[PDB]
Every structure is written in structure tokens, then in C-alpha cells.
């Protein structure tokens, strides 16, 4: 399938957490590391969206409406995928993996546990790289933004991506004629965890105790 192959190549290189070794571990350390991971990640996410067939033809208003409405779903999907091969750990980055003890110290036990729920479902379905990239483009198109101009244009974007996933599962998973749907049926838990993550960090924003860069702050606002 052309779109799937294309999304597979458009898939960016590993990004690193890079927590300072000189600085002693604390909750602000972790929270600041993560917020820095996210600003760098968001930069990449924006240049990747430019490779999604038919996205860049939308207006700048649309492209931005989708993006500021889906960015956290694209970030969590990323964490979730990388963690597929671990037990109760979340791989934010190769150089930054959190287990329970750690997530408590960052006060992200809940958010993380929600994210491991998502992990379990995909682990359980044996989510492949091809399904991950397609699912990510679909989460961007099906973001459900309010301020969208050309509604038909976006609906048309959801449909080419949908058909791409549908083709993949048809040619690759003939034994489960219902796999494309099982995949879509996970988008709801992704939406939920995602807005729970955006809210939580907005609070870290307010409490001023954690420095954040501009992009992460801008998205965290919007």
C-alpha cells in the first residue's frame, strides 16, 4: 500500500530525553526533562505532518487546527509504541524509561498508568509498525477540532488514510477480517488519556514550578 509505505519512510529518527547527569534526581528534574522532550518532539511532529498525503493542501488554519488539537495523541501514541516490548515501563525515549517507582516521584503515576492501559491493548493485539504510522496519521485527521474551515477537505483526508489502513489489514491480516475496526476502536482510549495528559501538564504550567519551552507552552495553551 502506497500511503502506508510512505508513512513508513516519513517516520522520524529517534529523539533523546538527555537528562542532565550532573543534576540530582528530583520531581522537577524529570518533569523538566519530559517537557523538554516534548518541545523537541513537537518540532518533529510538525515537520512529519507535512508528509501525510493531502494534509499540506489544507489551509494553514486547518493544518494548525488539527495539529493543536491532536499533538498529545501523537506524542502518547509514540510513547506507547516504543513501550510495546516492556513490562509496566514507559519508553519516553531510549535514554529515559520510567517504571512505577520513578513515575510516582514525578507524580505521574495516574497519567502513566492510563498510558500503560493503552500499552496493554496494543501489546495484546500485537500492533505492527505499519499500523502505528497509519493510526497516527488517522489520529491527526480525526482530531475533532472545532475551528475547521473546509470540513469536506478534512473528511476526505480521513477517508484516504482510513482506506489505507483498511487495505493493509486486508492484505496483511486476512485471518482477522475485523482488525481494521479493532484498531479504530482504540482511538477512544487514546483521546481520553491524551486530554488527561494535556490537562495535567497545564497544571504544572500554572504552578510555575517547572520551566517549559515556547512550543510546548503554545500547544499547552491553544
Amino acid at each position: 500500500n502506497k500511503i502506508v509505505s510512505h508513512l513508513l519512510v516519513a517516520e522520524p529518527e529517534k529523539i533523546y530525553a538527555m537528562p542532565d547527569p550532573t543534576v540530582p534526581d528530583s520531581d522537577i528534574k524529570a518533569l523538566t526533562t519530559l517537557c523538554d522532550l516534548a518541545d523537541r518532539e513537537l518540532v518533529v511532529i510538525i515537520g512529519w505532518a507535512k508528509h501525510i498525503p493531502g494534509f499540506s493542501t489544507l489551509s494553514l488554519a486547518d493544518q494548525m487546527s488539527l495539529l493543536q488539537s491532536a499533538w498529545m495523541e501523537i506524542l502518547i501514541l509514540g510513547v506507547v509504541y516504543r513501550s510495546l516490548s516492556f513490562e509496566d515501563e514507559l519508553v519516553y525515549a531510549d535514554d529515559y524509561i520510567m517504571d512505577e517507582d520513578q513515575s510516582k516521584l514525578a507524580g505521574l503515576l495516574d497519567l502513566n498508568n492510563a498510558i500503560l492501559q493503552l500499552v496493554k491493548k496494543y501489546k495484546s493485539m500485537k500492533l505492527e509498525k505499519e499500523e502505528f504510522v497509519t493510526l497516527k496519521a488517522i489520529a491527526l485527521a480525526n482530531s475533532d477540532s472545532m475551528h475547521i474551515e473546509d470540513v469536506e477537505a478534512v473528511q476526505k483526508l480521513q477517508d484516504v488514510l482510513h482506506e489505507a489502513l483498511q487495505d493493509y489489514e486486508a492484505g496483511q491480516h486476512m485471518e482477522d477480517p475485523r482488525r481494521a475496526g479493532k484498531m479504530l476502536m482504540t482511538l477512544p482510549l487514546l483521546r481520553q488519556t491524551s486530554t488527561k495528559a494535556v490537562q495535567h501538564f497545564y497544571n504544572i504550567k500554572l504552578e510555575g514550578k517547572v520551566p517549559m519551552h515556547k512550543l510546548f507552552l503554545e500547544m499547552l495553551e491553544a
Binding site: K50, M64, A222
Partner: peptide, 10 residues
């Protein structure tokens, strides 16, 4: 939208 708009635009 300031930053975002620029990254998308360029």
C-alpha cells in the same frame, strides 16, 4: 499559533 504557524509555513 505564532511558533506553530512559522514552523508550518517554513
Amino acid at each position: 499559533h505564532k511558533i506553530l504557524h512559522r514552523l508550518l509555513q517554513e
